[PDB]
Amino acid sequence: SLLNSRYKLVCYYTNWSWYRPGIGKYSPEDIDPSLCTHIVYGFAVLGNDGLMTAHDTWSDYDNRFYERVVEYKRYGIKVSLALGGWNDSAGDKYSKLVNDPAARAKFVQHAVAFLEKYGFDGLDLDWEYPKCWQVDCSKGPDSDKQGFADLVHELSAVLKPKGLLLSAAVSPNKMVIDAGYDVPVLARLLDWIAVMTYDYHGQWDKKTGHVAPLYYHPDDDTTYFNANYTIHYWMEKGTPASKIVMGMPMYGQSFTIENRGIHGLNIPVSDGGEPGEYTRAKGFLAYYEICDRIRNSGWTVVKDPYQRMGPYAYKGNQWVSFDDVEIIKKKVNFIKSLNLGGGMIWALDLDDYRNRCGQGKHPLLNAIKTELLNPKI
Ligand SMILES: *[C@@H]1O[C@H](CO)[C@@H](O)[C@H](O)[C@H]1NC(C)=O
């Protein structure tokens, strides 16, 4: 059992996975509580009044999704609510909040009342990102760093005496870490730091690349776009290993490659990949969409014999990089070897929870749990 282990397994739940057809539909009752130590609910958002509020009132309130996920506390799981996410981070509202001490003071008392009203065990901060709004460091003021650090302190001061948790999902990008994070403050105050060691590469690069490399690859344009660099950088900046939980993607980044008759890494790309039937997002495919293309649509799979990264798969002008069970076990061994706090997944609803691909239900997440519980490194 994971609840008896020395590691966390932090599972993100997404309320919008409900709005998918057929086998892609995901509900709170689909959560498998044997596979997580912590569940984080994505997402609440920052309202126009500077107060945390439900993003989807139809699901979160009218259909009681908050209560139906907090349900899983009865199994010994810690259930947190996440604030923010990529879409909520587009503008300046988080910046406006953290640069105004009076706005922070009002937000903090309301936020803890919000958590206690619905029974949440904690708050997860997912601002992407302080200073570098949606990764553009030219947008925000440097004071976002001190503002966010002070917000974390002020939340911790109210949450911790109540026994409530405080965590944050953070950038894997050296640039963002340098510009937006006061790492020693975050490392001291947060119960864990969920490092989003994925989306290193995607359609925005205009060439193919892996969503979540583990180690440096010779063809990389940087030394630092891999999980091994990222995790060591967080520690070098002052983060104890026990506070770090390493993110792992249950999905792939997809590409429409240019017509040049090649299919490897770093080949020119004209657009994101065609949307999947269930996830409906150009450039994105759930694992259960990827594994069906391999099994039943003849996509060719290319694996790294050195295991610096997971596989990629392609057919025609479509190309996708993702993590398979093999590289997942490698990443979890990495986690154990550095004595990190554990692992994190994005997201529950993107793994093959229905056993559509015949490897068993939740093949990626079960691979993580099995390897976390295996004493051998
Ligand atoms: C992982 O990163 C560490 C610290 O940056 C480095 O010493 C080591 O060479 C890396 N491991 C690889 C590339 O396999």
Author numbering: 1606 to 1868, 1879 to 1992
Lines quoted from the article behind this entry:
ChtII is a GH18 chitinase and possesses the greatest number of catalytic domains and chitin-binding domains in this family. Here we report the catalytic properties and the crystal structures of the catalytic domains of OfChtII, the ChtII derived from the Asian corn borer O. furnacalis. Analyzing the domain structure of the predicted protein with the SMART tool revealed that OfChtII contains five GH18 domains and seven CBM14-type chitin-binding modules (CBMs). The other two GH18 domains (C1 and C2) are predicted to be catalytically active (CAD).
The crystal of OfChtII-C1 was obtained by vapor diffusion, and the structure was determined using X-ray diffraction data at a resolution of 1.78 Å. The crystal belonged to space group P41212, and each asymmetric unit contained a single molecule. According to the structural characteristics, OfChtII-C1 could be divided into two distinct domains: a core domain and an insertion domain (CID). The core domain (residues 1613–1855 and 1940–1988, where the amino acid residues are numbered based on the full-length protein) is a classic (β/α)8 barrel with eight β-strands (β1–β8) tethered by eight α-helices (α1–α8). The CID (residues 1856–1939), which is composed of six antiparallel β-strands flanked by two short α-helices, is located between β7 and α7. The catalytic signature motif of GH18 chitinases, DXDXE (Asp1729–Glu1733), is located between β4 and α4. A long substrate-binding cleft, which comprises a series of conservative aromatic residues (Trp1621, Tyr1624, Trp1663, Trp1691, Trp1809, and Trp1961), is observed on the surface of OfChtII-C1. A conserved tryptophan on the surface of OfChtII-C1 was rotated 28.3° closer to the catalytic residue Glu1733 compared with the corresponding residue in OfChtII-C2, which could make the substrate more accessible to the catalytic residues. SmChiC lacks the α+β insertion domain, which is responsible for forming one “wall” of the substrate-binding cleft of OfChtII-C1.
